[PDB]
Amino acid sequence: GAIAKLQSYNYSHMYIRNANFDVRIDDNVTPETDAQWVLVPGLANSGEGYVSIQSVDHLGYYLRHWNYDFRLEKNDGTRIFAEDATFKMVPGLADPSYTSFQSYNYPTRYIRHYNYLLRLDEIVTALDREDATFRVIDSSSVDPDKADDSVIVTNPIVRRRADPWVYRHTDGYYYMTASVPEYDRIELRRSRTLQGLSTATPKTIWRRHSSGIMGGHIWAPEIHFIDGKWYIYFSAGTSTNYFDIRLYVLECSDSNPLTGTWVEKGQLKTNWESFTLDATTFEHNGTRYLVWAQKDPKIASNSNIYIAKMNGPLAITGNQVMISTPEYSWEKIGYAVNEGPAVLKKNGKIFITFSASATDANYCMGLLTASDTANLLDPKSWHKSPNPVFQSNPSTGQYGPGHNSFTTSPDGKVDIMVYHARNYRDITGDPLYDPNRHTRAQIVNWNADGTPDFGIPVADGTNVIYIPPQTP
Ligand SMILES: [Mg+2]
Ligand SMILES: [Mg+2]
């Protein structure tokens, strides 16, 4: 039939897999073939829509329910087996663009996971529906290992991932890290194209500690390659105060960061101890800098933007320098904050975008600009644009855009902004616990005056970001 992976809708790092003939959803599936299935015409009925789910490694073995529990079992040729191993593929119960699997012999019951085990249950609640919805990733899906010089995406590229960091490495892959909705782990994925980030198999490369430091909220990881090694800069609270957040570093010298060993290097200390988050790094003219957000107890803002020179990838040196603090009304809706700095170099300037206001629909982006020949450690080299440079747009239906990163087309010729936003405005409850910020991308245009034009957040759907020009 058709080889496929079956990815969970609500745990999109997790896949239906053979676990020594038991059946569960897991991340980090090893061997990868445990998550590979062949969708074949239904054993009990080969009509349109009916399928059976066969193991690739164990041909003749299929997913079969018994007492509402799933096992991977050898087809015994009986009618009861065929019926217990046949499903109708129907529009996803939680989202009709995804897939749900309705039992052939129990048509009110669907394949679902609970406590990570695969079951066949009736589906009542909104959570039941999410547990019963899956993404089929098959040969028709974008292949993350295939190169393409054109950049065409379908937004949202990655649902339910916030603070998206995309890094184009010198192996022909983009690497993506992001905040996950539970804020409890660091997830990494790679693809040769931006659109393939949607279908790439992520890996959980690190999970939070059970006690003490690095045991609270895990926020906004960024992967960088510096001096021949991989680094992840991330923000982590403690187990007794999820918001007592500091910067931490992981290091991996193995060349493939999805298979390599990651080592904790500890806290990246700054000039004082307080809420510190959202670090990024850039190099210019032989100096490396850290740029991050931090609370100053003496200033009534949740965080300000700081820069400092680095002494290698693990430390700053000298004094940190505040280059932005929230002061315009648009930086203070809900609360006064500047966070999520991202660096873009062009046209003789260093541009740093940042996000401001609360993380609901009011979230937006501002811009800092310095001449690239100026003293970057002098606050007066940095100039804040007086208005937001990217914000909600009711006409495109995108709300609270921010915590962006910048990458390029594969050929390096154009800049592309990757960021999160919601496709609805009103949020119920604490916005930190609304998980529906989705990762998306669009071109960065350039004004004739040399400054970036971020435009408005594009509506959901297909966006042609870049087609490479051709010499006559
Ligand atoms: Mg089972
Ligand atoms: Mg960041």
Residue numbers in the entry: 6 to 477
Copy the relevant paper text.
Here, we describe the structure and function of AtAbf43C, an uncharacterized GH family 43 subfamily 26 (GH43_26) α-L-arabinofuranosidase (EC 3.2.1.55) from A. thermocellus. We solved high-resolution crystal structures of full-length AtAbf43C and its individual carbohydrate binding module family 42 (CBM42) and GH43 domains, including a structure with L-arabinofuranose molecules bound to the CBM42. The predicted 580 amino acid protein consists of an N-terminal signal peptide (residues 1–19), a CBM42 domain (residues 29–160), a GH43 domain (residues 179–488), and a C-terminal dockerin I domain (residues 511–568). Taken together, we demonstrate through structural and functional characterization that AtAbf43C is an active arabinofuranosidase, specialized in degrading AOSs to arabinose in an exo manner.
However, AtAbf43C exhibits a unique domain organization, with the CBM42 at the N-terminus and the GH43 domain at the C-terminus, the reverse of the arrangement observed in SaAraf43A. Furthermore, AtAbf43C is the first enzyme in the GH43_26 subfamily from A. thermocellus, and only the second crystal structure of a GH43_26 enzyme that includes the CBM domain. Interestingly, despite the reverse ordering of these domains between SaAraf43A and AtAbf43C, the individual GH43 and CBM42 domains closely align. Structural alignment enabled identification of the conserved catalytic triad (D168, D283, and E344) in AtAbf43C, which we confirmed experimentally with site-directed mutagenesis. When purified and tested alongside wildtype AtAbf43C, activity on pNPAra was completely eliminated in any of the versions of AtAbf43C where one of the three catalytic residues (D168, D283, and E344) was mutated to alanine, indicating these sites are critical to enzymatic function. The H408A mutant appeared to have a small and statistically significant (P value ≤ 0.05) increase in activity relative to the wildtype enzyme, suggesting this histidine residue is not critical for activity. Natively, AtAbf43C is likely an extracellular cellulosomal enzyme based on the presence of a N-terminal signal peptide and C-terminal dockerin I domain.
